[PDB]
């Protein structure tokens, strides 16, 4: 039960714009209990044309906001991830709500919404969208926030992705399926 | 057993050049399972002059590919590798045959030679190299393939490393023996 | 006990300075028995006011140098880190001198004080400072040295960290809490 996924390729389950009346990405989260740190693995995949021609440009910003309750369970309604995790104990949802909390972020190491502090709590690094045509590698910044900030009542832990396009030129097509690189990345684990 | 790797300071195990007939460089690389993902841990030392003589220029690019088939097995022939792989248990291999596809990259989350799902299963970064007399750093991209095609019958899944350099003029001299520094993977494993 | 760490948020550990009569950061490191590997966090704070306007400038290099007995234990005296490293069994210290020597870097993997092999045991990344009163990321330099060279009769590992600003202006202020983004790294563990 030390991982806590969204499972391997799974159905459009994001909502990468404000707007969207339905899903418009795939993302892939692989979160994995290490003992004191969380190990994460984070890929997307643009699934509406809509986002598969943002890089159709030459710089974006496309970022997941995702938002858990006191027992580390998705809230669907507020996070843009909108299927639930599931631990893989199949690779089916594995059931017994035995505490998903040991896969949520510190809050004691990533506080919430709190100054005098300053932020401090972000993950920051370089994945990479390879071309349609063309095979070339284009660095777009990721960093993922941690606890930004209970929007809701409800909001215990929340982790945000945030991939940052500002290249020039970037794949003026559209079979610009968009895909993100994974991005290994780790952080301080909620006590139990 | 959640280790599999190439041991500890390991003897001439590559095949560099896509010439030799004697192995030229000496890989390390470690995979722990963890979970539904598999932490990686690679890095290379150069062994022959030739090899070594190649960061004498501001461009090289060296790639290992190896295959493995359905009990997670390395196969020496079709691979640059040409020793198996080990699991610790010792710091020597540890014997029995439970297979080894529990470090197996996921062919679900990265399919084999098919199109509509053109690559998007690469793993893209940056590792670097330490000159010889100097002491600064070249970055060199890395990018770790993952079930490319099945270069044989007897194939049932590939992991393709690929150092590459382009800078403007790099240690011009010999000692050069070449390092990668470690560069940190994860991916999917095999359901089982 | 798969956890060996400072403890989520410390109280000033360091000793930057090569001066400082007593510590100047806030060094956050967690280590992670995973199989033949270690998975490690790395973040530092800056206590001292000295410290807090070293990104006032255009380049910087700070070193914390860490050194450990043959049983793993931090030896305070020759390291700038002057509390030693706690097992998590609580988030408070766990006792039994079974050995912390298995979070411990390899001496094989990367040898002490030699010729021969010269270096060869780094590890190179990119972590990053983020602006004080703009959002804007510094990226800093990074290098792990691992089993530096053995400062006294008494030391067994030690674990090398040193961060490089090498830019062009950056946050000249001194809000500068001076907060050097997590940094993820892995390395061969000792035998046992």
């Known amino acids: ?7 391997i ?13 339905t899903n418009d990405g795939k993302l892939t989260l692989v979160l994995v209990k290490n ?13 509406s044309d809509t986002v598969n021609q943002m890089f159709t440009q030459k710089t974006a910003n496309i970022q997941l906001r995702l938002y858990f309750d006191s027992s580390g369970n998705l809230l669907t309604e507020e996070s843009d991830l909108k ?7 199949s690779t089916a949802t594995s059931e017994t ?3 998903s909390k040991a896969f949520m972020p510190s809050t004691t190491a990533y506080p919430f919404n ?7 709590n972000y993950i920051h690094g370089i994945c990479y969208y390879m071309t349609s045509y063309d095979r070339s590698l284009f660095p777009l910044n990721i960093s993922i926030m941690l606890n930004s900030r ?3 009542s409800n909001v215990a832990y929340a982790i945000q992705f945030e991939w940052n396009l500002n290249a020039s030129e970037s794949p003026e097509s559209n079979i610009a399926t968009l895909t993100t690189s994974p991005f290994f990345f780790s952080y301080i684990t909620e006590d139990d």
């Open 1 to 7: 039960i030390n991982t806590l996924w969204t499972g």
């Open 9 to 21: 390729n799974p159905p459009p389950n994001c909502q990468i714009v404000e707007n969207t009346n």
């Open 35 to 47: 003992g004191g740190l969380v190990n994460g693995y984070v890929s997307l995949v643009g699934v």
């Open 83 to 89: 299927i639930p995790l599931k631990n893989k104990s």
């Open 97 to 99: 709500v035995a505490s």
């Open 114 to 120: 709190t100054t005098t502090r300053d932020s401090e």
């Open 150 to 152: 209970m929007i809701s």
